Design a protein around this ligand. Structure first.
Ligand SMILES: *[C@@H]1O[C@H](CO)[C@@H](O[C@@H]2O[C@H](CO)[C@@H](O[C@@H]3O[C@H](CO)[C@@H](O)[C@H](O)[C@@H]3O)[C@H](O)[C@H]2NC(C)=O)[C@H](O)[C@H]1NC(C)=O
Ligand SMILES: *[C@@H]1O[C@H](CO)[C@@H](O[C@@H]2O[C@H](CO)[C@@H](O[C@@H]3O[C@H](CO)[C@@H](O)[C@H](O)[C@@H]3O)[C@H](O)[C@H]2NC(C)=O)[C@H](O)[C@H]1NC(C)=O
Ligand SMILES: CC(C)CCC[C@@H](C)[C@H]1CC[C@H]2[C@@H]3CC=C4C[C@@H](OC(=O)CCC(=O)O)CC[C@]4(C)[C@H]3CC[C@]12C
Ligand SMILES: *[C@@H]1O[C@H](CO)[C@@H](O[C@@H]2O[C@H](CO)[C@@H](O)[C@H](O)[C@H]2NC(C)=O)[C@H](O)[C@H]1NC(C)=O
Ligand SMILES: *[C@@H]1O[C@H](CO)[C@@H](O)[C@H](O)[C@H]1NC(C)=O
Ligand SMILES: *[C@@H]1O[C@H](CO)[C@@H](O)[C@H](O)[C@H]1NC(C)=O
Ligand SMILES: *[C@@H]1O[C@H](CO)[C@@H](O)[C@H](O)[C@H]1NC(C)=O
Ligand SMILES: *[C@@H]1O[C@H](CO)[C@@H](O)[C@H](O)[C@H]1NC(C)=O
Ligand SMILES: *[C@@H]1O[C@H](CO)[C@@H](O)[C@H](O)[C@H]1NC(C)=O
Lengths: 212, 316, 37, 158, 320, 34
């Protein structure tokens, strides 16, 4: 019917090496096989099930994913990012529509516990929690755009995470608006030919003028 | 006779795996051949103790023995109360040990600040401060104060503050009596919260040691100095404990604390603890030349009444 | 948005018509010039 | 009608070349700019069948051998360029059907597009729709030119 | 003569909220030693404890063998820090150890790295500056590599590396990279990185010279206080109005240096209202007999912003 | 911006149209005298 929708079912676009992530096509609770076409990094994969389960994410599992359920259209691409750090600020999304919602976290390496977590936005702290859990930001506005990072405590050592930028926009950018500039770019070429043809025609017409 | 029953125990050895902790029940001064030792955990008896009653020494009727109890690590980390029952001369004696509770539940830091010498010996209105830091929120946190001898405590004023790191702090201040502090009264500040497995308990008392009055010397501005500013220094040394108060005066008029500095005390050569500090006050040439005198008075608990010692410095 | 794209289409068609007519005039004047030769 | 039939021959041969070159330009820009793995193979049926390339080549070849028969008038030029016109007419006939099918596919896709700029898919589909409309107009022009040219070259052998 | 090993035990008491003393008592029992041939010393995290005056008590004597113990008092705050307390038993030139801690969990304590700059004395007087990358809290020293990388040039020196094993069952690694004084002065930025196979990323620390507006120090020396007539004499040295805070002070006694353990210096205190100026006091206390030997003391100070050869000395004598 | 570019392109088109009309009428009148 309509387009397909691909959604990870951990809703985190940033994960660490060894994390488990499952990718879901149009959406149901079933691993229906021989019914889905999966494209990763512009190359069709051998997976044909409705669910693409990754038990241990690797650096090579990053990139772009597209699923196409049988009888439907191709889906909007989703990006997965796999990294290795000490502290990583997980986020549910990097671009949020108005009145949207997104979560953040502060996660450490390989099931290590973080304590005394402080969440910063543009170098200004807005929350603190002893444990590392969700920070749900509902009904997003333009005030919720900036650079995010967290500084927690490892086993006993303070560590700092890299800054992540989340932007709230009225509507998504469609990344292909320059394609409509081909038509104006072609008219100037055709119009330039017209001016060149005048000079040749006027010169030839002037040849008869001088003859007379 | 009253034997001195004390309970000692071992603990983790970082250089070994150490999957066992040993309990000892020393009895000192008891009547010889009149001692019996029994062990109970959580007020319930244990029979398979496998104790080793070994005598230590004998002094006439008086004698000393001890027992050894071998418990596992998990039996100790469970915070169960282990008690030793001593049967001497028909009487019963007790001694309890537990694994001490965590002092920072949920990462909450608590400080108990003693009264300042200026309030204790000059103003006469001392106060104890209990600072609770790193709080997720102020709600449901209660603070209680306990004395040692009397059940009558004063009213404690409590305030909350949210800092720049999005953390809340609570400051409870209890006015105390200078005399009771002088005799050596003890005070506690018990912080409680439903999510705390155990309450936070902090105690404070007057600092123990051997007191010694300080010696203070004042130096004129350096003769090599003839610039815009003039510097006056105060040297206080040979005092114990670390609690001292220093304030500057100008023609018998107090100077704000932001117009002078003081250094952190440093220990001096031991083994008996001694400290020294330097106090510096820098004034301009025009102020210094206005034909007056300056003063450097200190307040300490080792000085004779009224516990004040002052030294005046002037060009005349 | 849509209106500007419609204008772009109109401009493209105008360019096509103009270049076709100019080609016709060029071939006519060239034929006349060779005839005069 | 034969006196009229002479002058148009050169101009229709000229316009075929223009149609072919514009087709080639469209094909080149579509092939280079777009990442075709993110879009459907039924929206891109125009480019998936390679119509711009084998249309431009045949149109330019037909134009080149229609602007020579009015300049040199050799016996191997006529009857040697009508095969370059029959194939051009066939290609133009197939292109119209291909473009109609692509327009139908584009309408079917755009049914589930609440706005022209909802995402990359709807925007690219609309751009391809208008490109296909322009290509259809040019293909109709080229087909008419080829049909007229064939009519001229077959009328003098009747 | 054979060596008879004794048995060493480390027992202690327990915390009690219901009490007010807030102290913990430690006992180091030793049995079967030789009379008048023992010495018990207390340590806390490889640091000797002086200001405690541990009490030594004898238990009994059994022929040539005897048993004693030594008691130590510590505070609740020291015990709660999870610091290892050691009693060292010395007998006939041999040492026997006993350690204790607070029973806790098996958390894998993290690794802390410190990067320290060269001292001004070596930079401007000795001429051989060095950097140090101190790595602490390692379960073992294996599979650990430390590398030094500059920013401007690429000719690094030979960095010697050493390891140490502590009483708290931890290992420390120190590496020293000798550098050039001029290159440091011009504003080079070095960094030290530590790598392990289990580290997701290397631990990186960077250091450069302190940025700010330089100010030359001014030093004054004061005579012993007039009111003093006791058996000791105190000599002070006021150094103020300098930037940065990295400074070196050494006392001279008749052109002969005095060891750093005989004098103490206060930590720099910032003042002047964001003008970034510091001041320190240097105190040297000599006894009356030592002072009365008609000497000529000196307070020599080496600072970056001083004029060549970057040293300032003030002379104090009782004659003048 | 796209309206502004359309403005210059339309100006170019108008100029070319006027020039084409002028040249056409000139050539037509020249051939008439022939
Ligand atoms: C969030 O910010 C606050 C304020 O900047 C931090 O509180 C501060 O914590 C330090 C150490 O934990 C306190 O210093 C202590 O002061 C007591 C009393 O003088 C002294 O006895 C201790 O030795 C220590 O120096 C400091 O007073 C306190 N600030 C205030 C205003 O009370 C807090 O630690 C920060 N939390 C995080 C997670 O970063
Ligand atoms: C085990 O025992 C060792 C030895 O006492 C402990 O090492 C000591 O650790 C402290 C801080 O962790 C070091 O203090 C630091 O010193 C540097 C160098 O001056 C200074 O720049 C820092 O600001 C800080 O004060 C101390 O130097 C270090 N001692 C040695 C000899 O290396 C270790 O922490 C203990 N570990 C545990 C888990 O108990
Ligand atoms: C590249 C796309 C964007 C534009 C394609 C159109 C023009 C760039 C090219 C393609 C076809 C070429 C035309 C094909 C052949 C002719 C025949 C030629 O007629 C003559 O030979 C007249 C004699 C002379 O004056 O040279 C006039 C140029 C013209 C229109 C060429 C002009 C330039 C054209 C129009
Ligand atoms: C899919 O493409 C992504 C890039 O978008 C690849 O991710 C890179 O992988 C290399 C290792 O080969 C890393 O060095 C890069 O840092 C990665 N880039 C990012 C942005 O993380 C990924 O490897 C590709 N996977 C496959 C199977 O081709
Ligand atoms: C926390 O976030 C995860 C992932 O975003 C979500 O699945 C879960 O329901 C959230 N739970 C709470 C209590 O917010
Ligand atoms: C967003 O930030 C601005 C800047 O201070 C502030 O004036 C405004 O009130 C904020 N938005 C809301 C909804 O409070
Ligand atoms: C007592 O406990 C210690 C702990 O190390 C153990 O070695 C010993 O065998 C135990 N003795 C008995 C009798 O259980
Ligand atoms: C330790 O404290 C106890 C109890 O106050 C005291 O009897 C003992 O003398 C103290 N030990 C030392 C060495 O001061
Ligand atoms: C550490 O180094 C040793 C030899 O230096 C090597 O055999 C070993 O594989 C390395 N890694 C570990 C985890 O031991």
């Amino acid at each position: 019917t309509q387009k397909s929708v691909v959604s990870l079912d951990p809703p985190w676009i940033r994960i660490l090496t060894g994390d488990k992530v499952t990718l879901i096509c149009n959406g149901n609770n079933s691993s229906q096989m021989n019914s889905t076409k999966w494209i990763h990094n512009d190359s069709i994969s051998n997976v044909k099930s409705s669910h693409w389960v990754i038990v241990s994410a690797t650096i090579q599992d990053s990139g772009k994913y597209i699923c196409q359920k049988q009888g439907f259209y191709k889906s909007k691409p989703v990006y997965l990012n796999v990294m290795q750090e000490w502290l990583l600020l997980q986020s549910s999304a990097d671009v949020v529509l108005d009145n949207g919602s997104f979560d953040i976290r502060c996660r450490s390496w390989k099931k290590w516990k973080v304590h005394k977590v402080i969440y910063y936005k543009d170098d200004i702290a807005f929350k603190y929690s002893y444990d590392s859990n969700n920070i749900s930001i509902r009904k997003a506005t333009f005030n919720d755009s900036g650079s995010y990072h967290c500084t927690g405590y490892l086993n006993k050592v303070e560590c700092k995470s890299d800054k992540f930028s989340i932007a709230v926009v009225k509507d998504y950018t469609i990344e292909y608006r320059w394609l409509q500039l081909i038509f104006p770019s072609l008219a100037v070429i055709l119009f330039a030919v017209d001016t060149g043809l005048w000079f040749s025609t006027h010169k030839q017409f002037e040849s008869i003028l001088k003859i007379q | 006779t009253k034997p001195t029953v004390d309970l000692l125990h071992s603990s983790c050895d970082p250089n070994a795996f150490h999957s066992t902790i040993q309990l000892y029940c020393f009895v000192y001064g008891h009547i010889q051949n009149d001692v019996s030792i029994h062990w109970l955990m959580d007020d319930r008896k244990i029979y398979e103790t496998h104790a080793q009653n070994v005598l230590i020494k004998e002094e006439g009727k008086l004698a000393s023995t001890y027992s050894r109890l071998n418990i596992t690590q998990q039996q100790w980390m469970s915070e169960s109360t282990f008690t030793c029952k001593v049967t001497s001369q028909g009487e019963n004696y007790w001694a309890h040990t537990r694994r001490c509770s965590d002092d920072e539940p949920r990462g909450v830091i608590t400080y108990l600040i003693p009264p300042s010498p200026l309030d204790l010996y000059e103003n006469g209105t001392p106060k104890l401060t209990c600072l609770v830091l790193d709080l997720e929120s102020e709600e449901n946190i209660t603070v209680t104060w306990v004395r040692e001898r009397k059940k009558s405590i004063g009213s404690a004023s409590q305030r909350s503050t949210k800092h720049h790191n999005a953390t809340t702090s609570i400051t409870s201040i209890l006015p105390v009596d200078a005399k009771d502090w002088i005799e050596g009264e003890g005070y506690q500040c018990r912080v409680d919260h439903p999510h705390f497995p155990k309450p936070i308990v902090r105690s404070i008392t007057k600092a123990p040691g051997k007191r010694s009055a300080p010696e203070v010397y004042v130096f004129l501005p350096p003769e090599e100095e003839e610039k815009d500013k003039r510097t006056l220094t105060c040297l206080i040394q040979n005092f114990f404990p670390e609690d001292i108060s220093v304030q500057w005066l100008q023609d018998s008029k107090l100077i704000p604390k932001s117009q002078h500095s003081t250094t952190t005390p440093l220990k001096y050569n031991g083994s008996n603890q001694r400290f020294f500090i330097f106090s510096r006050l820098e004034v301009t040439k025009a102020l210094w030349t206005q034909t007056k005198q300056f003063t450097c008075r200190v307040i300490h608990e080792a000085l004779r009444e009224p516990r004040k010692l002052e030294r005046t410095i002037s060009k005349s | 948005p849509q209106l500007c794209y419609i204008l772009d289409a109109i401009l493209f068609l105008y360019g096509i018509v103009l270049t076709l007519l100019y080609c016709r005039l060029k071939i006519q004047v060239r034929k006349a010039d060779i005839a005069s030769r | 009608w034969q006196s009229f039939l002479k002058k148009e021959l050169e101009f229709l041969g000229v316009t075929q070349v223009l149609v072919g070159l514009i087709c080639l330009c469209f094909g080149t820009v579509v092939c280079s700019t777009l990442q075709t793995s993110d879009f459907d193979d039924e929206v891109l049926l125009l480019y998936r069948a390679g119509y711009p390339f084998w249309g431009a080549v045949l149109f330019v070849l037909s134009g080149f051998l229609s602007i020579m028969s009015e300049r040199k008038n050799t016996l191997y030029l006529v009857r040697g360029s009508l095969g370059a016109n029959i194939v051009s007419s066939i290609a133009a006939g197939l292109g119209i059907a291909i473009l109609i099918l692509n327009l139908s596919n584009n309408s079917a896709y755009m049914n589930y597009c609440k706005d022209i700029t909802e995402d990359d898919g709807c925007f690219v589909t609309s751009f391809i729709t208008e490109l296909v409309l322009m290509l259809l107009f040019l293909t109709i022009l080229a087909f008419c030119s080829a049909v007229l040219l064939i009519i001229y070259r077959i009328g003098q052998e009747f």
